[PDB]
Design a binder for these strands. Sequence first.
DNA 1: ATCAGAATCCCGGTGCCGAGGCCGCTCAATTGGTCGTAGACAGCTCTAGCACCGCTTAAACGCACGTACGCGCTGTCCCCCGCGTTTTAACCGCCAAGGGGATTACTCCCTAGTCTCCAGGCACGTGTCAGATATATACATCGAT
DNA 2: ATCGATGTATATATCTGACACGTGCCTGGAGACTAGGGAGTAATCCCCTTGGCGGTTAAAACGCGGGGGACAGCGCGTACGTGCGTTTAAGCGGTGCTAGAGCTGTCTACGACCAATTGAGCGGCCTCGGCACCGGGATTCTGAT
Lengths: 21, 21, 97, 100, 76, 76, 101, 100, 113, 113, 84, 84
Amino acid sequence: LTKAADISLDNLVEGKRKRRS
Amino acid sequence: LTKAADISLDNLVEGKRKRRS
Amino acid sequence: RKRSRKESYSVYVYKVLKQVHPDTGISSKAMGIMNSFVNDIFERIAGEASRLAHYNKRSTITSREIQTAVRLLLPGELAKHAVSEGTKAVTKYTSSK
Amino acid sequence: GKKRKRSRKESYSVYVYKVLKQVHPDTGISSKAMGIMNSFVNDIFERIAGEASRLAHYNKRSTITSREIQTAVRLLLPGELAKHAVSEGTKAVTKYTSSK
Amino acid sequence: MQIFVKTLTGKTITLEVEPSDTIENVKAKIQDKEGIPPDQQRLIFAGKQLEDGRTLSDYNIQKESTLHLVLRLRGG
Amino acid sequence: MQIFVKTLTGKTITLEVEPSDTIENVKAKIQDKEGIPPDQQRLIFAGKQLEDGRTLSDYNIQKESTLHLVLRLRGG
Amino acid sequence: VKKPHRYRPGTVALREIRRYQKSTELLIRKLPFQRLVREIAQDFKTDLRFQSSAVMALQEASEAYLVGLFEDTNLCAIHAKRVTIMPKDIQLARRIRGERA
Amino acid sequence: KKPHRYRPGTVALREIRRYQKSTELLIRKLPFQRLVREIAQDFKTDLRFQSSAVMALQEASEAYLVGLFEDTNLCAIHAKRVTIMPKDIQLARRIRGERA
Amino acid sequence: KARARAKSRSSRAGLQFPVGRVHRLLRRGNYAERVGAGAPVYLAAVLEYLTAEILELAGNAARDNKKTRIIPRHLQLAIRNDEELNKLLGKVTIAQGGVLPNIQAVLLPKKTE
Amino acid sequence: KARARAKSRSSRAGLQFPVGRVHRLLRRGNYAERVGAGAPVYLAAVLEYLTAEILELAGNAARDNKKTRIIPRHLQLAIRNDEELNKLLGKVTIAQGGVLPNIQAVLLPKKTE
Amino acid sequence: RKVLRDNIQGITKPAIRRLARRGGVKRISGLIYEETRGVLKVFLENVIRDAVTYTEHAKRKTVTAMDVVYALKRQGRTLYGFGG
Amino acid sequence: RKVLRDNIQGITKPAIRRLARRGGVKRISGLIYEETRGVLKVFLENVIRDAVTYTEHAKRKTVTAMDVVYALKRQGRTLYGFGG
DNA sequence: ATCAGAATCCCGGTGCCGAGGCCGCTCAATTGGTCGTAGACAGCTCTAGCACCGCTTAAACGCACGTACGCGCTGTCCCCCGCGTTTTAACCGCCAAGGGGATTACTCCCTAGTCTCCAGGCACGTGTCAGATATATACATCGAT
DNA sequence: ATCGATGTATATATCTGACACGTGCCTGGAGACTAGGGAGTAATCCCCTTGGCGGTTAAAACGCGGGGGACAGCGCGTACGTGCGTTTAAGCGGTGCTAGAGCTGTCTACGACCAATTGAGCGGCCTCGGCACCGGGATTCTGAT
């Protein structure tokens, strides 16, 4: 559910993004 | 010898371009 | 409420047609091709003319710009004629009133 | 003294270099390696703008605001990476929003 | 009535509150427990800016309705 | 002295002239042989605009130096 | 039955290839192609709307896309001298174009 | 007899490890330059080069051909022929579409 | 006081495209701070050259199928024949396009004694 | 008068990139008639996110070869490992790049020899 | 009467064949029909997203032709005739 | 000395092999060396033109790095590190 | 496997030049401030998108059969790889000279901005002929006998 | 080789709706004017490029010899093309409903633009250490046996 530049800044999971390699 | 937008507009051979097919 | 005129090149297209082909007609869809067809080339051109400005740090797009971009953007001999027609045009417009 | 002086050639290097210590306090970088990053920015950077641009026409907006960029972000970046990018930018905006 | 707030860290702060409690009261309580003065604080509800004089039920803020925490930095 | 002019058609016009001959004279001769009045005429030398009072040797125009023909259209 | 005349195997296609290259019409039967979208549409957002024109675009592109896919793909098994395609060819060909990697 | 000869193909597989391991440019510098100036001359006579700028081609050029071989490699592999053949390039390029 | 008449830069180039309208586009096209007066003219004709250059191919190809009204297929069939133009539009696809009739040799049929 | 302190929008976002300078770029970037005040900020951070996201990969990879100073090869070796980023830059090549060590199985040695 | 029957299987074994004919393919293996439908969706996937993405950026509930267009162009597939 | 000569043959049979190694090519046919040099030039051809074309548009007699750059980008090859 | 035997890796010493750091100047950013307009937002209408149905049938599905192609095997012949030695020109370091690109100050041509003026270009309406559709017939060729 | 039926090719007549045209209404371009800053030009600078020269030193070359990979021939096994009867749902046009796009109308917030003050960021600077260089000893395979 994309928005208007809300405050939904939801997740500090980026480490899992870095895990993708 | 390319130029500055000269008056060298040299050839009306385009028919040969059309001949390429 | 209803108008605002949606501008095309259609008429402009249609004029050209009779000069090359006095006989032939065209379907709107076929027409729709051309109208879009213009902008795509057209935008391709401008953006390159733009890039020239920075790389020369010119603030202004003049003729000399466009031509340079033309030789870039168009392939092969077609460019030269394009160069030619535009040139031949400029001169003819140059002496105008 | 200072002849004919080389007009300052701007980079992101320092900016790059700052970030480095936050993620890697230890590591250094070679100019060539640095040279990568500095170029690396603009490429992404120009990709972004041009898309933000295209939005304007297609909405006939005359102005690129934030809402624009984000839209382009989701276009341009692949996969989950976008969302975080969305996130950081968003988190930034708010934090800058209340500023002054 | 219990609600939460989510942070830049995603910290979820436990809040025992009432729908008539002022933002003035709330931030103070966060100032109270978390020691962070409101001067650098604001809380978010659905992106809207919170004024002290407003209460929770003013925004139709319900129990366990979680909010977006902000550090507003003046200086630096 | 013989020179030529090249056209939009690439027509190459034979010209018996003299380096002191005026553009006034030249176009008239083209008006003379080709019937096209100077009003709609101009000739080009290396992209420069030709004034009547100028002569050929004014531009260092040599024999068999070929020129670019123009129809200047006023009206339409 | 007294001997049906059966076109030699492969002869049908070579008529179709002439045929289906000769005319312009869209090979995918329309309506199901639409339904295919609305599903995929739903996942990104619920409750979305389409100018029936706009759907046609995909169809135009989609068929066109797969068309261009086959040519190189065709060349692949031909480059293996196997007059029949094989699925790896797509996997090969796409890998070549770089849509994957 | 005596002399130890690496079985055929063993050399390359060391080189492939090797030449993928390091970064340096495989084309001899100076001749590569001369190659340009010729091609340069045809479009305009009497042209000048920042020796840096030449390096770019070299960087790109090698890089380009590198990416060429991979699919190319796959080609004859897709034909199960461990050796490349010129048609493969002709095949591969016509696939990428630089030709048609 | 007297305009008395009127003249169009397009006519002033004796060319069919609306120099004026194009020249309007660039002004708002965000393509530069300023627009050279000469440029659009030069820019205009180029298209007016191409538009013919393509249609001519179509028309001839349109006559080939002996239908007096140009269709898309022709345009498609036209474009892919010119060895130059194909490289212009190769990244581009055409509505109702189809492709050129083409067959790989080894796939051709055989008696071929 | 007496503006009396100073503050930088970058600091105002607590972010390392020069919001001001970027915000200058778009103004002349011919990218739109006007520039939203908010936009560049948002635009800035994104890069400031990426620049880290890449370097982090490099640094770890830089430590792998046990050289405290990042080199291009690492960046190259870094980028091609992330399965996302590769699709960002796939069209792009890197100076001094090289490629990942890679070998096709059937080309591997043995036959058990 | 329920929801969600088949869809992607709605691209039929004969249908794709027609394309393959236009593709200039003389004989077709059976498993092709599987992987084919795999790619097709995968293609349509990222394509639709963007036009959708534009669409929401337009705050409009409907996908238009122009939407699909701008999807293809930043994709690299740029198309004509439904644009404008 | 006379006039300029071999050139393109100055890309040597061993040299290209090195690339092929980086290309991950186990064994190489002989005729490769021909067609290889064919493509290489053809690539360099259009590439150089543009940077040249920019260069004359700059009214400057010298090709710079930035020139080669802008050649690749409107080509689609965009590169880093020699760009300023 | 089990052997020596290469070639490659990892290691401790040394060494040099580009990193990464500070010195200080300057020019791009920031501040405070005015002005107007792009676009937000609420109101309103009017297109076309969705929905739903049934008469019609062209297309799709499913199975039967065998043909001719995928591929697995073999077998030959030569085109590349390995390796030792013989031949070229790549490279590095060093200085020398002037082309051209970089920077600066000046004037004037050219383009943005602004207003008033009107037909080029658009939508709108309309009437007819190019082309699509249906149906009979002749021409070509493939495959069966 | 001759023979038949199949699909394509083509000829007709036939019916329909889309292009192409004429009419009239308006918006975007033309016209004429100003004021301002871009760019062009000329005048000086110095940096970067080219050039030419000679020393070792690796890399290119070239050949030799034989191994294994390419390629061609063959044969087996089977999958995929073809056809037919059965089955399913696409396409048609026809009717009904309102959601949402697009057009509209007012007020004002946010951006551009100007000026004056301030340090962030760049080039220029030197010293210093991460790392390129290597000669010796540690390992990890390759081919021969």
